[PDB]
Design a binder for this molecule. Structure first.
Ligand SMILES: Nc1ncnc2c1ncn2[C@@H]1O[C@H](COP(=O)(O)OP(=O)(O)OP(=O)(O)O)[C@@H](O)[C@H]1O
Ligand SMILES: [Mg+2]
Lengths: 50, 48, 49
């Protein structure tokens, strides 16, 4: 059961990472002050990967 | 109208290069630019 | 009588300000500039001093 759990979490995390990474390209370098672009960083947490 | 001119002119001038003296540590003086007591503080704009 | 006055504010080697002195007015000083110009930085200078 624990193995199946870990597997389903890994698959869901990968799917969500892919979705968000595809979505990130929906931004076109907004110009606000010295901010030239906005982006979303999605990364699996090593503290949780272990 | 003088004020409404000064501002605008400065807005137009500061987009054109920088002033090299601003890194010298020597403050600029308040040069009078008219009667009635109007003054301006800016180094010469050299590096375009 | 004759209230003391802050005459000047100096910033040295700060982000955007290597060496900048502002001559504080006796009544009103108004910083003006676009977003990110660094006005909050100047008031930060005053307070931290
Ligand atoms: N601690 C900091 N670390 C990194 N960058 C900073 C820091 N503080 C300010 N900045 C940057 O310095 C620039 C000036 O910031 P600041 O907030 O002083 O601007 P401002 O013109 O006073 O802002 P506003 O008019 O919107 O109140 C901006 O690019 C800001 O991102
Ligand atoms: Mg600010």
């Amino acid at each position: 059961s624990s193995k199946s759990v870990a597997n389903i979490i890994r698959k869901t995390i990968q799917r969500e990472q892919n979705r968000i990474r595809m979505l990130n390209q929906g931004l076109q370098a907004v110009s606000f002050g010295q901010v030239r672009g906005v982006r979303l960083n999605v990364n699996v947490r090593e503290s949780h990967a272990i | 109208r003088h004020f409404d001119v000064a501002r605008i002119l400065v807005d137009q001038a500061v987009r054109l290069g920088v002033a090299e003296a601003d890194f010298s540590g020597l403050p600029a003086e308040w040069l009078a630019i008219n009667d009635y007591g109007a003054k301006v503080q800016a180094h010469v704009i050299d590096t375009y | 009588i004759e209230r003391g006055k802050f005459r000047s504010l100096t910033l040295v080697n700060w982000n955007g300000f290597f060496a900048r002195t502002f001559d504080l007015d006796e009544l009103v000083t108004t910083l003006s500039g676009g977003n990110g110009a660094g006005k909050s930085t100047t008031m930060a200078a005053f307070v931290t001093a």
